Design a protein around this ligand. Sequence first.
Ligand SMILES: CSc1ncc(Cl)c(Nc2ccc3c(c2)CC(=O)N3)n1
Ligand SMILES: CSc1ncc(Cl)c(Nc2ccc3c(c2)CC(=O)N3)n1
Ligand SMILES: [Cl-]
Ligand SMILES: [Cl-]
Ligand SMILES: [Cl-]
Ligand SMILES: [Cl-]
Lengths: 123, 123, 4, 4
Amino acid sequence: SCIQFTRHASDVLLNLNRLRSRDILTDVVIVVSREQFRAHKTVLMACSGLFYSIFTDQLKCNLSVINLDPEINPEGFCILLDFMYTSRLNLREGNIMAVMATAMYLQMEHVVDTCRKFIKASE
Amino acid sequence: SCIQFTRHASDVLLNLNRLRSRDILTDVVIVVSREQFRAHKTVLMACSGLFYSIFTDQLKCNLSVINLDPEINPEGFCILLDFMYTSRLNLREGNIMAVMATAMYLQMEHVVDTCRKFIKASE
Amino acid sequence: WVIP
Amino acid sequence: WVIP
Ligand SMILES: CSc1ncc(Cl)c(Nc2ccc3c(c2)CC(=O)N3)n1
Ligand SMILES: CSc1ncc(Cl)c(Nc2ccc3c(c2)CC(=O)N3)n1
Ligand SMILES: [Cl-]
Ligand SMILES: [Cl-]
Ligand SMILES: [Cl-]
Ligand SMILES: [Cl-]
């Protein structure tokens, strides 16, 4: 018999992004080919199967720095980190291959699906 | 020129609630008349003007325990904590006064508005 | 607010 | 996915 507030999830995510932009309560640095990205472990886990596995590990959960595979493109990661905090994906002809490869590595199934569909349309 | 995934914010919140239910990466205990509630500081800040003010304070941001005002009802708090993580509010005739008072204290403007409207309908 |  |  609950009532539901339609915009609540969107409003929560908007505030989480405001905390990220002001670097408030960020608890991890993600290192991608020397580029560094500050984020909230909980948001990363909520969006990515790879971060979920990393931060539920009894040893890795305590790390303040996570280094990604050297093949990961920093721009692809940045676009995906923006998507995690906003639901908006900046998908372009020039970045789609790097975005799909990063989403496959991060285990972000819905992003992988839209990239596959956009690539299939261009062939 | 971004694309947007409609269900992303809802999916993020659902995963944050799954982390709460398994007590994963919770970083604060909220004490309400001896009852204790574990939560994520970021989610509390994203939902409440009071928690936002508390955890942006240079001294309070580092506290692992927050004690609420003794007038706060633990059931009212529990209903609101569930709303923060799910967008669902368990509003009932028997709890509406405690829920409205707790939402006013927590500075959760949308909850206060729906309680005021539901109370006005009953008079 | 809605009935979910 | 939609055009926001
Ligand atoms: C599976 S239970 C669960 N509980 C809590 C969290 Cl934080 C979580 N995240 C997560 C796991 C897998 C995947 C994603 C998020 C996005 C994706 O495409 N795959 N999962
Ligand atoms: C105002 S900028 C901002 N930036 C980040 C966060 Cl985490 C935040 N939360 C917050 C502040 C005030 C209120 C709420 C949340 C819910 C409500 O009714 N009032 N606000
Ligand atoms: Cl470390
Ligand atoms: Cl995804
Ligand atoms: Cl403490
Ligand atoms: Cl609210």
